[PDB]
């Protein structure tokens, strides 16, 4: 298996771990803050997914410092993981185009 495909699969597994850990740590950080809505794990996981994908509907958002720091990690992990997937697709296309050119 080539590196870029192994790295993509590794990034996908790492992203799932960030989503699960991010959902657990957000609830742990948001409870205790009056008005916080990111205080139950099922919707916290939904919030983490729409954060890593950078969709950000606005139905859920962190208000505490550590809840927002968790959000930052989720954002970077999601942007990086999907970016590595795009990078792997580019390598696949470039490698196929080299063979298409004989070189």
């Amino acid at each position, epitope marked *: 298996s080539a590196l870029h495909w192994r790295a993509a699969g590794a990034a996908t597994v790492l992203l799932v771990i960030v989503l699960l850990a991010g959902s*657990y740590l957000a*609830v*742990l950080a*948001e*409870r*205790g*803050a*009056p*008005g*916080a*809505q990111l*205080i*139950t*794990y*099922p919707r916290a996981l939904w919030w983490s997914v729409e954060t890593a994908t950078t969709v950000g509907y606005g139905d859920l958002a962190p208000v505490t410092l550590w809840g927002r720091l968790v959000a930052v990690v989720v954002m970077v992990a999601g942007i990086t993981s999907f970016g590595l997937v795009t990078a792997a697709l580019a390598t696949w296309f470039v490698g196929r185009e080299q063979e298409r050119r004989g070189h």
Partner: antibody, heavy 118, light 108 residues
């Protein structure tokens, strides 16, 4: 089997302190929160605080006077609420409840009738 | 914090009649309301979770409705075992808050 086990009663002198217990059994997950609810005779339910035993962080109701300290012991699966400087206004029934991190209190304890008297 | 008003405090119903309990929230909480039953000298018992979801072991006559700020707990054909206090509790915003409570009494 009963999931949350609390003592029957505790007699506390005015100003003295007491520590209540709540032995947990059944399924226990890392997403468990133990809550404490206060109910005076002739009153509704009053949320006191919460604690996650898999991490040890405790939150408290900021509307009321803070007279509690929530601890947890994972080796014996027992949460503790330490009440300090008790007056007659603190005499109530104190329940413990287990929340699976999804909002509601699925199971309650029998409650410990705390009577502050001389 | 979120305020949960339950009015009226006492509901008088003759046997075998439907009875509805009211729980109004100071602000919208979607469907994050939960109902509990407490008989005399008893511990609270979960009846309905998330406004309208059933609980295993709870009789079929118990149901719930509503979303937003107004929530209803309905009991089809009230019986003597249903004589207790009924509380609502919200889980949308921290901290969790309870309602003042509504007592059910039967006119036999």
């Amino acid at each position: 089997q009963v999931q949350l086990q609390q003592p029957g009663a505790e007699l506390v002198k005015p100003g003295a302190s007491v520590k209540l217990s709540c032995k947990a059994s059944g399924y226990t997950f890392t997403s468990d929160w133990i809550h404490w609810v206060k109910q005076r005779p002739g009153h509704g339910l009053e949320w006191i605080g919460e604690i996650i035993p898999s991490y040890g962080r405790a939150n408290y109701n900021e509307k009321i006077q803070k007279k509690a300290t929530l601890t947890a012991d994972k080796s014996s699966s027992t949460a503790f609420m330490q009440l300090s400087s008790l007056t007659s206004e603190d005499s109530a029934v104190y329940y413990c409840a287990r929340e699976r991190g999804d909002g509601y209190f699925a199971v309650w304890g029998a409650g410990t009738t705390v009577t502050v008297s001389s | 914090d979120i305020l949960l008003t339950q009015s009226p405090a006492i509901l008088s119903v003759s046997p075998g009649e439907r009875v509805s309990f009211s729980c109004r929230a100071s602000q919208s909480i979607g469907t994050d309301i939960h109902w509990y039953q407490q008989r005399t000298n008893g511990s609270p018992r979960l009846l309905i979770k998330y406004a309208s979801e059933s609980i295993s072991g709870i009789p079929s006559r118990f149901s719930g409705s509503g979303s937003g700020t107004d929530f209803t707990l309905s009991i089809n054909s009230v019986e003597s075992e249903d004589i207790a206090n009924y509380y609502c509790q919200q889980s949308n915003r921290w901290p969790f808050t309870f309602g003042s409570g509504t007592k059910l009494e039967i006119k036999r």
